[PDB]
Amino acid sequence: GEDTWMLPDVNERIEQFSQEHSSGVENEDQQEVILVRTDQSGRVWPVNTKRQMVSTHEERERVRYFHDDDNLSLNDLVKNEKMGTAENQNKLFMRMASKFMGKTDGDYYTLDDMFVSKAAERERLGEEEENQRKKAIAEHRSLAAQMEKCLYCFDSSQFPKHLIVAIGVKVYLCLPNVRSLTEGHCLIVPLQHHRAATLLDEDIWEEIQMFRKSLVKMFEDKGLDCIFLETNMSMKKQYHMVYECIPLPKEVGDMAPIYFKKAIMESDEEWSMNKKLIDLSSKDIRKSVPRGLPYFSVDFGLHGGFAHVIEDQHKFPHYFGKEIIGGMLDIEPRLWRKGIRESFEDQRKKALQFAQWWKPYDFTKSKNY
Amino acid sequence: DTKLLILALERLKEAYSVKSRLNQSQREELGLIEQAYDNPHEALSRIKRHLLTQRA
Amino acid sequence: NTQELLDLLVKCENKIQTRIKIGLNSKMPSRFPPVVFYTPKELGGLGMLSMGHVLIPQSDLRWSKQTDVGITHFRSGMSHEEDQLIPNLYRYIQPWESEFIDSQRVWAEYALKRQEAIAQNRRLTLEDLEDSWDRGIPRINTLFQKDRHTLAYDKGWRVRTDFKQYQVLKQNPFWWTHQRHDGKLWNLNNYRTDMIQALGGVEGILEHTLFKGTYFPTWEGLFWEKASGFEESMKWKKLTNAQRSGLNQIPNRRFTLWWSPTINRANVYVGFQVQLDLTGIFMHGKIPTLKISLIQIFRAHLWQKIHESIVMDLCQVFDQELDALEIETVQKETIHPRKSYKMNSSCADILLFASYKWNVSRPSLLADSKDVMDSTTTQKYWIDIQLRWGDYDSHDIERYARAKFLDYTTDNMSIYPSPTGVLIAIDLAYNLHSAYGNWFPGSKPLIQQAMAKIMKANPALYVLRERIRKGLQLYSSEPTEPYLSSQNYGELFSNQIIWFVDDTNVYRVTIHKTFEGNLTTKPINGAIFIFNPRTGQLFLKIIHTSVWAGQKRLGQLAKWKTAEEVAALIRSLPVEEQPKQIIVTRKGMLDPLEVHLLDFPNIVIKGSELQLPFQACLKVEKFGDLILKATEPQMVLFNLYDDWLKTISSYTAFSRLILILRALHVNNDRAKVILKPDKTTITEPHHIWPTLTDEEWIKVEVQLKDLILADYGKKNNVNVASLTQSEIRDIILGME
Amino acid sequence: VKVIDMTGREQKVYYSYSQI
Known part of the structure; x- marks a missing residue:
């Protein structure tokens, strides 16, 4: 029954959706998948589709510094600058990073002089072709590869399908794939990849907070407390968003602001630029971290906690939020680095115990007659 | 013993905070460290077997 | 006490500062500013720690800002003294003699504090603790170390760290301590806090930087990056390490750009100078990467495209205000392109023809308020527009304006139609503007209002600002155009055409099981919701599921497609029916819609922080049936x-509309019971809502309100009775 | 593009938005 077994309440909400029934191409091995490029800010945009050193000078006079400078109209700057390259800086640099350039001998042939000489035309719309190959195929394959190996991506290959407890409209509750650090460990996961909470839209963030407020209410009646972790690493690897919920006793959760204050300040590069430990008590994550750069964030129940714009990825572990909790609760290190897998059908019937806790607190339906 | 193992591994890994550029022998070391974290009762039996028997 | 060693510290500091200088050439010519070294890293300086008696020149304390009054100058901190002198470390570092005495207090004082706290039977908490967070030789804060339970076995640790020098080929200065057991053992927050005050405060530092050029509102929410430049793993895995002589300089790009209004000074790089051939920017000496960074920013003739834009957009005011002034007509000279950076002289850009003859006031600043004396002078008036790229020494724009005005008019290097004119001057490096010259009645406040609008509205400046920002890799959290907020709501009922736009119900999706039992998801039909508040007009473009064929999945292009539909509508809608302002419920839609509406720059686009209950309205069965079938x-x-505006005030009718939808959102069928209190209640079949008298409407409005407030109370877990009528109104309108 | 006026007591069908 590995492919068929699920919680009844989940099946019922599926039946409720069921009862409501009562430009480039890139032919990816059969289908058609419209070309899109993402910028630094996580916006989606469609992708449109001998040498002679170029006549860089007029008669004893300089009139252009790129061969295409004279073609662009006023608005065609404007359109491009609203949807542009992440950086267009390295592309000249990467060409001059090739060997056999000689060297800049101090004066007379500066790096500037090199750069200005390099700025001849790319071979017969080579700028478009290199842009097309980089933006389209590379991103789409990377996204597809992650999608296929995704846990949280609803219909993908692995997808445990029975750790689902709730299903709202665009997010759902899940339970972790491993031996589950604390007793009532649960997750708040959106359906689509969004990679971040600052990259979310308002309706989805509002719906996460409804789950967030409800899970606090459940654990407060049992006498526990909540810590909500969001770890977002570098936005080039396309991991799925997960908004964790790690319940732990009241007589430890009182200490939880203190321990994280210490850890975040020491967590990373000394001489960091970005002034570590953003305070999320009043303003919240959506308007205290810019859109499109990596961060860790932590929240203490209802009251918001702290945030930390990560820099130098390799020194900041992705498991950081679990590690501090696993320290103070005195849990052995295996439980958060790489996890321990469970019995693939037997031990993963912890959902029976977890669903009967969350039955009075279900908001995702009204058919509770 | 498990507590002493964790302290040993941590002060080994601190040598590699400098850079991501690693040679073959260093990548092998991080491999062995990660295994010891993932399965302590493996390494503890192997360490104790070294003491009793290894002399060259 | 070791005077021999203090002299070595001064020597070592001066050497390393010279190493930075050579990275920007400079060589022997002095007067290099100290601000770039000691400014903390969060402001984009190097953050150098000081251990010598260096001092700042009194010229560097100057700063200035422009407001609606005009420019104002300030001169930080000085009453007379030159004594601003970049704090030593030593004053902020506590002696060992005090540390060994204080540790006998704080480790005893804490022991008492927890003993009564556990007698109080509650957890010790951060407010009890911040007064003594950072004291004792074992620092007090080490008690909250992540893994403290396991560190209790780590004996011998000081011997071990001293012996690490025989194993690790690096060398580290903290061979005598480690943060795991001793804690941090120093803190220089206080040092950073008054380093800023020594240099003249935050507002005084930023004049030495391009910050004003980026036109962010304020310096609070700024963030840097260093993980996605050229310095990726590409840079280090790339073969042929001997190539690192040109591309050895390129990490410094950001630093050189950021500080550029004080590296590029005439007063420092004494010598021959040049002008970059497509710009007005002068350069002194050969700065290693500033020339690269500027040419990128002004790529594709941006100087002219700033200039000729501002010329046309200024003339557009005179193209409307024909009868506001004693003028008959205006003309655009369309003169030769290169005048925009012909610094030696200028022609006029615009020409104006009197009805007969004005009065000429006097040659005076844009800020000069009053009086007239000059002869009437028939027919001919002109304006010139001057761009420049200033720096720290000469960012004063009003002295510049008056200077250039005299220079060109006094001699034959320039031709103007008449002596009666003015020149505008704009410094693109600091976004300052002013004017000097002759004026005529009404024109002076008109130019003031025009320029105040131009400096935020103009597309060509937006191009320039975004390029500087993205080139600096400097990001912000809060800044946007002003949100729609509660106190603005009366302006929505003005005579302008205004639309709301909402897209939340476009890319809806349905989970279903396959017949093989595995789960998956189907998309379903959506709609684009467009509504007029002051007229009630609504549009509803049904998006049928088939448009996402092939695409499907994550629905990425849905927002871009949404803007296409809106633009297609507005293009085909008659010109007089076009909105003045479009207000969008979801901020993610702003960038797609803006790009598609560039052909119609009259349209204001505005985002709301105030959400509205439209999302629930599409679940009304009268609409839902249509979309599904x-x-x-x-x-x-x-x-x-339905018919309400025939007797009801529009904002009161809007209030009723908002109430109904919000109530349906929160409690659905229970609101319908208020809509249908008896089955014999009636409606026209064309109408959305029942036929009722105004008294009957007032009755249900109170009832729907009371439900909304009760539900607001329940989910906020709080008493409703404290709320005022205005607070009630705000909660209904959207958010407090 | 088809339009279906349902603003009130009559139903009208435009076939381009310039007709509106």
């Missing part, structure tokens, strides 16, 4: 005020 995309129209 539809099989091809088609537009549909509604008026949500």
